[PDB]
Amino acid sequence: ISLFRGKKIDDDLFEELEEQLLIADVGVETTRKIITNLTEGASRKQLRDAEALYGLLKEEMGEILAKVDEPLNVEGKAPFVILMVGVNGVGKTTTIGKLARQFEQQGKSVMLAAGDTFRAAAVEQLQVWGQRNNIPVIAQHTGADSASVIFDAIQAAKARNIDVLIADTAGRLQNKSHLMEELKKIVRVMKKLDVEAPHEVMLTIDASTGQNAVSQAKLFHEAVGLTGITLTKLDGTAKGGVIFSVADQFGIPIRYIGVGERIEDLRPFKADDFIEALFARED
Amino acid sequence: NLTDRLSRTLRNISGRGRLTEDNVKDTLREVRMALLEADVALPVVREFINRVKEKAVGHEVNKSLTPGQEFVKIVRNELVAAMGEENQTLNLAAQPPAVVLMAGLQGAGKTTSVGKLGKFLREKHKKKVLVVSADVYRPAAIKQLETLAEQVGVDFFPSDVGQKPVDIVNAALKEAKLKFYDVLLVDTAGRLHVDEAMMDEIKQVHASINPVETLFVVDAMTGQDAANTAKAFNEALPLTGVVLTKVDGDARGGAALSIRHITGKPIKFLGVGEKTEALEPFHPDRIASRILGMGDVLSLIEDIESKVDRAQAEKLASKLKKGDGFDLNDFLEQLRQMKNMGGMASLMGKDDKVLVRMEAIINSMTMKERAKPEIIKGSRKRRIAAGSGMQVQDVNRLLKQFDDMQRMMKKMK
RNA sequence: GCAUUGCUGGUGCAGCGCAGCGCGGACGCCCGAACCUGGUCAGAGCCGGAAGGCAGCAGCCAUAAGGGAUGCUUUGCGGGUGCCGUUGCCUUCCGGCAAUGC
Ligand SMILES: Nc1nc2c(ncn2[C@@H]2O[C@H](COP(=O)(O)OP(=O)(O)CP(=O)(O)O)[C@@H](O)[C@H]2O)c(=O)[nH]1
Ligand SMILES: Nc1nc2c(ncn2[C@@H]2O[C@H](COP(=O)(O)OP(=O)(O)CP(=O)(O)O)[C@@H](O)[C@H]2O)c(=O)[nH]1
Ligand SMILES: [Mg+2]
Ligand SMILES: [Mg+2]
């Protein structure tokens, strides 16, 4: 970032900015769309100062995330249902543990559902997150129907008077249609107790994931209808610039960001601070 | 468009000329844009563009096919060899109780692949497998491998969360050698390469137990980040194999070319599902065409080449079979070149009805009958005379004269 | 916390059904009969006084019999197929509301 100050504006510096934009996994259709706004913006004001390119980039990137900045409002409904969906191994179950503790912080009663009745010891894994927060977990032995288990967890969340219910699902890849109609099947049985439910369809996306995130958002939204996004494992070298392509194409709001394996390592999404961390020249 | 049909014919034209940057620069942009969309890192993309350039111009020029399509072959062929120099490099088991260490980032597919590895080495390779977990961080990660071990029918090593990961791997090998287990499959926690703390744990574990196979598990959909990941994980640990997971997905899998380039260690396994059955031995030919994306171009190049290859072989086989020098096809060509002469042999060599009759008999014969006179027999002789309007003796007379001709041809010239 | 009881749900079988895989045929594409299929019949053959015909081989085109690569197509048959659907059911296994008891 600091190396850009002591440089003159030319076609070589624009190529230096494009390569540092692509290395963030932003895309091709998304990177070249911003460069078209920058080359037009450099003639609009006619500025040959290095201080302007860093500012102009933060302005246009911050404009995209301005459309998708709405925070999650779990209050009002009883029980508010949050359906956790995404591909295999993105942080879904761990994110629920982080979420349930930020809602207890807000002063709302939380209950959990063990829906990954396909992966080994997934019930046991969510049960540990329940014990870490001192929250009830409605669960059945792995192999049982996920849709019918979440249905029994809602019937429990209603009767025990719970403010927020976070429902877990299995790791499913968008191309596996049978697993996709299984996700639709979950929501179908949910409407039998509350037509508004699920009140949120939170999609967890790994920061290190590339252009697969495009179809990950597309086919998950086309099937159930996403209303939330959590960009987890962002604590590493992973910038996860692919989120700019997602919001520009589908406009699903980003609710939280995963920055560690601990319960406290979760923050709500902030647009302006996210751009500053994208070009972070730190070791 | 009207200019569209005009511009298409100009490029479709046979480019006999040397493969130079002028034709490349226009179509090289399609390759660079596909590779970036495939999720291949920039240092490997930029180095591979220069790698193709040295081979493209260097005497590799074809007369047929589009100039922007004959360079695609150089991209495709160099992609297969760069990905898999050796096809199916299996885990070494020619030493005492073999140690297989599994390491990668958080949630790559380690414990599942340990389970999928169990079934491979147990059913297909018939070995005494022992599974261990050093993951004392992920909730119920120990119970996860315990169920996976029960699924395949492989013996599992007990562990606690209170137990130190360095002591688990040390005591694991102790029980492995005692019961003479063929392979010791070691599963470790999710580790971020940035973290100095746990990256020192895996290094200490790699030292504690000498792993004959250090398999680096990485997700198939991982983007540009794979550059930072492959560098640090090879610079810290001496890797011997890569395990690519979630390959069943619609993701191009650009990281696979990114991992093989930076580490230089060959990919050994491919995961094609959540199930235990979902393990395939590495093959680059399949994954190379999946990273490229453009299959409609390669489908025609391999279809046009085959059309040319079959035509070049068929037109040469007929010439090699007719290379004997003489047959009735050559004899008929001699008659017409003689009849064309306005003076005739009758007036030159000091009988006319014989030559006119001889042309009709060979004319009634098939292509096979002309090439080989020996196949003409009983019913074959009766067919020639019926259509020619001659006799069985006329055909037999003609064949005798031809037999003495080839005897005279082979003896002289 | 445990049992009993009611309702409900999943697993679990079992029977139909789909999806799928294997094998057989359709349809189609391509190849394809010296002669004993047809069209066209060069050369050559025949009948008549001529004029005109008749017969027909190669080739070339079409194509029975029969091969071959394959197909979001169609169907019949069969499964140490099945992160599907459905009806039925029993032994246990496990959940969800609700009533009692220690
Ligand atoms: N470093 C880091 N690791 C994370 C983060 N979020 C989750 N993880 C980790 O990633 C791994 C997978 O997390 P998990 O919560 O099991 O993911 P999942 O999507 O539920 C896995 P499945 O699809 O199988 O249910 C775990 O090791 C976990 O600790 C994060 O923000 N940072
Ligand atoms: N579809 C598909 N899923 C896979 C493949 N390999 C692993 N998975 C899945 O990805 C998820 C993560 O797998 P897991 O084996 O727990 O990964 P891990 O790296 O051990 C997680 P941690 O880092 O916490 O130990 C699981 O849901 C699992 O079923 C694959 O090849 N295909
Ligand atoms: Mg999970
Ligand atoms: Mg693991």
Short mmCIF file of N, CA and C in Angstrom, two decimals, chain B residues 11 67 83 102 105 113 130 134-135 163 168 222 233 236 244 255 258 264 314 333 380 382 386 404:
data_model
loop_
_atom_site.label_atom_id
_atom_site.label_comp_id
_atom_site.label_asym_id
_atom_site.label_seq_id
_atom_site.Cartn_x
_atom_site.Cartn_y
_atom_site.Cartn_z
N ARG B 11 -9.70 -16.54 -40.88
CA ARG B 11 -9.02 -17.26 -39.80
C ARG B 11 -9.02 -18.77 -40.05
N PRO B 67 -4.74 -21.11 -37.17
CA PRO B 67 -3.51 -20.77 -36.41
C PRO B 67 -3.74 -20.60 -34.91
N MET B 83 1.27 -31.39 -14.79
CA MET B 83 0.38 -31.83 -13.71
C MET B 83 0.70 -33.22 -13.18
N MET B 102 -1.08 -36.61 7.56
CA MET B 102 -2.05 -35.81 6.82
C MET B 102 -2.06 -34.39 7.37
N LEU B 105 -4.99 -27.03 5.58
CA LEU B 105 -5.74 -25.96 6.24
C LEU B 105 -7.03 -26.47 6.92
N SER B 113 -10.76 -38.33 4.19
CA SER B 113 -9.77 -38.96 3.30
C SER B 113 -8.94 -39.99 4.05
N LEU B 130 -3.85 -48.76 10.82
CA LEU B 130 -4.09 -48.18 12.15
C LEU B 130 -4.27 -46.66 12.00
N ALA B 134 -4.70 -36.50 16.01
CA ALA B 134 -3.96 -35.52 16.80
C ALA B 134 -4.79 -34.24 16.92
N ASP B 135 -5.97 -34.20 16.23
CA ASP B 135 -6.91 -33.08 16.30
C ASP B 135 -7.56 -33.11 17.68
N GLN B 163 -4.72 -35.06 26.11
CA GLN B 163 -3.46 -35.62 25.61
C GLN B 163 -2.75 -34.63 24.68
N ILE B 168 0.75 -38.14 21.37
CA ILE B 168 -0.22 -39.05 20.75
C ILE B 168 0.46 -39.80 19.60
N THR B 222 -10.42 -23.94 -3.82
CA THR B 222 -9.54 -22.88 -3.28
C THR B 222 -8.91 -22.05 -4.41
N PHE B 233 3.48 -24.46 3.19
CA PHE B 233 3.31 -25.87 3.55
C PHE B 233 4.41 -26.77 2.98
N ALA B 236 7.92 -25.51 5.07
CA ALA B 236 7.93 -25.93 6.47
C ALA B 236 7.98 -27.46 6.61
N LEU B 244 -6.41 -34.03 -3.42
CA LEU B 244 -7.39 -33.04 -3.86
C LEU B 244 -8.80 -33.54 -3.57
N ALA B 255 -6.61 -24.79 -8.56
CA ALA B 255 -5.61 -24.92 -7.51
C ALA B 255 -4.71 -26.13 -7.73
N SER B 258 -1.93 -25.12 -9.56
CA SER B 258 -1.22 -24.19 -8.68
C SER B 258 -0.39 -24.94 -7.62
N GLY B 264 5.87 -28.87 -6.38
CA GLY B 264 6.59 -29.78 -7.25
C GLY B 264 6.35 -31.23 -6.87
N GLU B 314 -5.22 -44.59 -45.27
CA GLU B 314 -5.99 -45.33 -46.28
C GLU B 314 -5.45 -45.09 -47.70
N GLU B 333 -4.71 -49.40 -68.52
CA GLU B 333 -4.15 -48.07 -68.74
C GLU B 333 -3.20 -48.07 -69.94
N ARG B 380 -16.95 -66.67 -61.01
CA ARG B 380 -16.35 -65.36 -61.29
C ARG B 380 -16.03 -65.21 -62.79
N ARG B 382 -17.68 -66.94 -65.26
CA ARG B 382 -18.99 -66.99 -65.93
C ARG B 382 -19.72 -65.65 -65.88
N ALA B 386 -20.82 -63.22 -69.37
CA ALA B 386 -22.26 -62.92 -69.48
C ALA B 386 -22.54 -61.44 -69.82
N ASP B 404 1.71 -64.24 -68.44
CA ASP B 404 3.00 -64.23 -69.13
C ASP B 404 3.59 -62.82 -69.16
#
